Symmetry: D2
Subunit: 121 residues, 4 copies
């Protein structure tokens, strides 16, 4: 799925995920969030299954963004875990975890959970 | 926290996380799970906040493993999202999402959630 | 939102959630899953905010199903946590956690996470 | 596990969970959080597997708290999903989802995730 994954994707919030899938299972690119304490692009890296099952299952992948770039530092990181589903209406269906740096006393409240669906349109 | 994070960490299951933290916010290394459909080491990559708050908050980070290497392919990826807490008893406290490639009909059941705490001992 | 919540709801899988909202914040009813190790109806209970904010925010609620009834026992429980959003296209937007009873050795793998959206149609 | 579950439990934050397990699978009681926008006791309800496996697996259960009582309204609900593990050092091991009522624009950020372990001591 190297060719299927590589490219520009967009989620239901309007965010823009720009990724390149390597032959070796790497994911590299940039993310730009339409919401939250974010502006412009941020580095991302991640990994995907480069030899998925051939039975119609999706392709497992994940990636991370730390929310620091030249413009802002939100002292936080998001990880997306999901699967690519190929075809005419290709999708990446994810669940994510956003952790903010906290004191020990506040660590119970450190982590948001949600779900993003990415399309090529 | 480049120096604090770089090194060999171990979780409550006995898994071994070997990471290098780059000046630029990168995390690279290897993971070896003590449980599940895994053997030997797997590539990891991720990101961390290279300019954390100085008020005692933790350092936000995350990373991914796709569970393919030369030995096995578990058609799955885990993402850990968490924070590094420095000091005498340093820790990485994480929550994780493990997604398995599924058919559309089974996608409701595609994703495990859990929590790992990493120590240097 | 007692009147808004009480009734029959349906999710994106085809499952059927039948609930009554009490003046006191209680939720009682039945759930019938279209997927998984389930047949027929199962008891549910839960709670909702009976005095929500008046600024356009949603109404927080949650509920549980243990997957035992007269037909089957899946040795598992799901909890849905979410919010009711009223209006012409009313919705309950949830995230859920499904825990299966495991041995200690398998407890790392005990919990699925996902997301269901309920509509009145 | 009716007798095993019924009673007063305490988590790693110092919160106090007071529950009664019914023969029919019901859980009823009160919760008092040591942290967050909470004071005093709040109603809880939930469900547990009243006929667990006899192979050493844990007992699946869950419960909800809406964070409204006579003192405060935090416009939020938590659901805990987990398993009871009996024996000399009995435990309830949970993962939880806390949803706050939000506008549509903020709904991406509506839900915290975490994990609580309850003991009888």
């Amino acid at each position: 799925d190297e060719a299927g994954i590589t490219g520009t994707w967009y989620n239901q919030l309007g965010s823009t995920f720009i990724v390149t899938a390597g032959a070796d299972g790497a994911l590299t690119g940039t993310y730009e969030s339409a919401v939250g304490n974010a502006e412009s692009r941020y580095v991302l890296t991640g990994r995907y299954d480069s030899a998925p099952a051939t039975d119609g299952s999706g392709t497992a992948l994940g990636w991370t963004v730390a929310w620091k770039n030249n413009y802002r530092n939100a002292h936080s990181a998001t990880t997306w875990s999901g699967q690519y589903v190929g075809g005419a209406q290709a999708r990446i269906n994810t669940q994510w975890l956003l952790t903010y740096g906290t004191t020990e006393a506040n660590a119970w409240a450190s982590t948001l959970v949600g779900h993003d669906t990415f399309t090529k349109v």
